[PDB]
Amino acid sequence: PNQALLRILKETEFKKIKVLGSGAFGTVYKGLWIPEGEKVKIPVAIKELREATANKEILDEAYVMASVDNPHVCRLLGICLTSTVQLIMQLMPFGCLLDYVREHKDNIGSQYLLNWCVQIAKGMNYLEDRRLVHRDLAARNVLVKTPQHVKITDFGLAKVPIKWMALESILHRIYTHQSDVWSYGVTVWELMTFGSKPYDGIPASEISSILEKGERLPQPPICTIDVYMIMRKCWMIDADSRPKFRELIIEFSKMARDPQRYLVIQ
Ligand SMILES: *CCC(=O)Nc1cc(-c2c[nH]c3ncnc(Nc4ccc(OCc5ccccn5)c(Cl)c4)c23)ccc1OCCCO
Numbered sequence: 468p469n470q471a472l473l474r475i476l477k478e479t480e481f482k483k484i485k486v487l488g489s490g491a492f493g494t495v496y497k498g499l500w501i502p503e504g505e506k507v508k509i510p511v512a513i514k515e516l517r518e519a520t521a522n523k524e525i526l527d528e529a530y531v532m533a534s535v536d537n538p539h540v541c542r543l544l545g546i547c548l549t550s551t552v553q554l555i556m557q558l559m560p561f562g563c564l565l566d567y568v569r570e571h572k573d574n575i576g577s578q579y580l581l582n583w584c585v586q587i588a589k590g591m592n593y594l595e596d597r598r599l600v601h602r603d604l605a606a607r608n609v610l611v612k613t614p615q616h617v618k619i620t621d622f623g624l625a626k627v628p629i630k631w632m633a634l635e636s637i638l639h640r641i642y643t644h645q646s647d648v649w650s651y652g653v654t655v656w657e658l659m660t661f662g663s664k665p666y667d668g669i670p671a672s673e674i675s676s677i678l679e680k681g682e683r684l685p686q687p688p689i690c691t692i693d694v695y696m697i698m699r700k701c702w703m704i705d706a707d708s709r710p711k712f713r714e715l716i717i718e719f720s721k722m723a724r725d726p727q728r729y730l731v732i733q
Pocket residue numbers: 487488489490495511512513514554555556557558559560561562563564565566606607608610620621622623624
């Protein structure tokens with residue numbers, strides 16, 4: 468492992484200043500990274516995982532998270548191991564993409580939406596090239612660095628997100644790059660509906676019977692048949708029939724050149 472890519476941070480080297488959010492997983496803080504022997508204060512997010520009841524295996528996974536080098540995947544900048552695991556990475560000031568599209572739905576055009584689809588596919592393709600499976604891709608796990616630069620987060624963990632999972636993950640706990648492609652399709656559906664909840668009101672335990680019957684998320688009103696057919700291909704039962712992320716980059720890149728042709732907005 469290339470240890471230099473991962474900073475092991477002392478408690479004095481970072482400060483939690485404000486709360487970004489909390490859940491069963493833990494708490495994320497906005498803060499500053501103040502490296503010793505430097506004259507800089509770096510805006511960061513600090514995620515403190517819930518205390519659990521060892522260090523060598525954690526660092527091994529952290530080394531992998533620090534080794535990711537792609538503009539559309541968040542990189543682990545540093546770690547602090549105490550009673551808890553604290554993860555430090557660059558602050559993404561605009562927050563998660565799901566909240567972003569909900570807050571800006573009136574003001575989001577077709578080029579923005581298609582560009583995000585390209586960027587998310589590029590990040591996922593990078594993870595696949597690294598033989599890394601995400602297992603939790605969703606619009607809530609894409610962060611907005613600036614409005615046209617998004618990055619995937621929450622990879623490397625090593626409420627189950629049933630509504631984003633491929634059928635084989637629900638039924639057999641099989642997770643592959645092709646099940647990530649299923650989740651990518653749901654994520655695109657979230658963006659194209661401006662943050663709607665997938666299968667809203669349906670209990671998680673009912674989702675597999677919906678998929679088994681051939682029912683799928685509906686075509687978003689702004690989506691032409693061309694865009695929706697890509698999404699539906701992501702939800703085929705046969706995982707090897709779903710698109711590859713490499714193919715998704717190409718297709719959405721083509722559509723981003725003529726966005727008005729493929730999304731009908733306003
Ligand atoms: C969509 C709702 C949402 O996610 N709300 C948010 C947003 C943030 C947030 C805002 N700006 C930010 N900049 C940088 N990071 C974060 N969050 C964040 C995410 C993951 C992190 O780590 C990665 C990781 C890897 C493996 C396993 C688990 N995590 C880190 Cl260090 C930071 C961010 C923050 C919180 C938040 O809501 C939290 C409650 C709902 O989850």
